[PDB]
Amino acid sequence: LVWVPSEKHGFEAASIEVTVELQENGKKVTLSKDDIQKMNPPKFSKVEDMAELTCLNEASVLHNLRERYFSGLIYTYSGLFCVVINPYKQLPIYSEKIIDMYKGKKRHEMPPHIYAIADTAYRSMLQDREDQSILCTGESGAGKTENTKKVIQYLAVVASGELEKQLLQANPILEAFGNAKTVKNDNSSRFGKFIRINFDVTGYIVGANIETYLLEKSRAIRQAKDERTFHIFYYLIAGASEQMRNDLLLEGFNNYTFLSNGHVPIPAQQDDEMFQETLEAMTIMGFTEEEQTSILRVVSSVLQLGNIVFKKEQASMPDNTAAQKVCHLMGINVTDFTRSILTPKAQTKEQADFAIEALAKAKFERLFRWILTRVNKALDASFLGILDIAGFEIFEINSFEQLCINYTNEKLQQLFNHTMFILEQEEYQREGIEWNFIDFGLDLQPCIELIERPTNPPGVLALLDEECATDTSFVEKLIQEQGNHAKFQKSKTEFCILHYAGKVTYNASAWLTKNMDPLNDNVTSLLNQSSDKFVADLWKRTVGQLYKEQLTKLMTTLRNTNPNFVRCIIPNHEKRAGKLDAHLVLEQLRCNGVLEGIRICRQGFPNRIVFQEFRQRYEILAANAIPKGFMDGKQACILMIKALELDPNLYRIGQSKIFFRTGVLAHLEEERD
Ligand SMILES: Nc1ncnc2c1ncn2[C@@H]1O[C@H](COP(=O)(O)OP(=O)(O)O)[C@@H](O)[C@H]1O
Ligand code: ALF
Ligand SMILES: [Mg+2]
């Protein structure tokens, strides 16, 4: 019996170039030897930790995952890291009762769960007095958020009671203004986010600070088919009280042009419901009724901006109604506004339209930054970062937003590679372990440099910053500079980047403008001194550049924390539950380095404890192991190990600690009880 490749399923069971006979079709086939992969004994049905597997190959991992999946188990430890496959359905596994069952539990004492990741990260923090970070990876839709949300849910329920109560409102609020339905995801985060929870030396939660990245402002004014803008718009429009309806001078879903595809209903969501849900959370978060109405008022103005209309001839808006409403909602002067918009320098429809849009997006980006800020005020020894970035996406038309998002995903995958494979081995040699380096063949440096290479060989981002000159002109130079670059491909101002997750063909249209983010300082000032305080508050070098900075500051913070990767796999592309796309899964398992991540956890020594700790934790397993009196950590360990009759292959004695093979300490622990 063996694993042979297959179309329907990544691999198929077949009994033995080689000529086997498929167990399903029965059809006898003749395939190369290198195409066959060994099956594992039935004893390995749904192993919780695939490092355990006797045979570790794509075929066995995929199988182990497929099985647990349809068995309702979506979490599977794979070496150090963990894998999660979107159930796309509700599962009875996130109760509070279960949070209890997982309290202070060791990874090996409980089936794989995001709670375990949360908890073990928690303890490890106190245990080694080192800042921790749980990093969720995954293509758009995989599950990064549902899981980030579970980690916070768990932590709030164990170390906290207001803070906790509000902590659990952070996302419900943020999601409402920064999430939106994309073809890939209905509740898609259109902005990355690093939630950092602060604890005291005791271990109790003390603060919490949320940092967000790359908010897709553009979505505020346009969305592709079957796509809708930020939830909050649909929420307010659909659930505002009649008095607010006309207080905000709100319209209908088809009275607003920024609402591209009018009202696009969500699966299992009710806008009117979510609106009260949002107001409830804002309430809990501590927002005053006026803070909330002021926020909702800004949302409305952003929609009304879209209704303004300019005509050709310069450009002139015959109908100022919208311009009137907008100003009414902004505490601005209709004529001062109309003037600053139509002539700050003559403006044509084309440029009048732009300015208005630019303002819309700018107005929203700030309302978000504000809400976030306010949330941070209300939420504010050791910290536990949690990173829910915007997942890799390849939409029909990929703009500058997607480049940044996917670039960040490439940056995160690399962080995984580095940690998992480089840092791992570095520590080996550094601690003096008999170890010969293993090039696991996983490096994204190239592509990453092809984008963020500031100096020396100009990269996409910097070439642009330079560019700002047609957008197309940008593409032309980008080619002449990169063109050949391995992870580059000439294509309408389009080009292709071969991201680890796949080949994305970008469209540089408007990129120059997008990277500059030009506002109409005229109207901009008007708002700066709006009769309305909130507005005024809201309005009290290049984008690419700004991001690079923020990203690096993050990577660094992350660099100074013990990372815990949770690899989220998307099962299918039909937002369907119970449909595991064997190949979509295999591909994901591939670019995530999951197999290489399990090999190193096997070929190396994942666990590693300091002499003393090993001595105290397991001296009981060999009481008559160490001399009665003073016994140096090292010699003491060496004694105990001998006393335990540990196979020398199972460990290594480094300078300051013993390195153990996967699951060795585990067994030691089990024996210990
Ligand atoms: N463990 C889970 N339980 C329930 N639903 C989940 C789970 N994981 C993901 N989902 C489903 O997948 C969808 C999107 O996952 P999400 O967390 O939004 O991904 P991402 O942050 O990577 O964009 C949700 O709208 C939900 O229906
Ligand atoms: F909402 Al995403 F990756 F698309 F977290
Ligand atoms: Mg998300």
Curated annotation (Swiss-Prot):
Residues 45-673 form the Myosin motor domain. One of its GO terms (molecular function) is actin binding. GO terms for biological process: actomyosin structure organization; cardiac muscle cell development; elastic fiber assembly; myofibril assembly; skeletal muscle myosin thick filament assembly; smooth muscle contraction. It comes from the Eukaryota. Keywords: Actin-binding, ATP-binding, Calmodulin-binding, Coiled coil, Cytoplasm, Methylation, Motor protein, Muscle protein, Myosin, Nucleotide-binding, Thick filament. Residues 551-573, 652-666 are annotated as: Actin-binding. It is found in: Cytoplasm, Myofibril. ATP binds at residues 138-145. The keyword Oxidoreductase does not apply. The keyword S-adenosyl-L-methionine does not apply. Muscle contraction. Belongs to the TRAFAC class myosin-kinesin ATPase superfamily. Myosin family. This is Myosin-11. It comes from Gallus gallus.
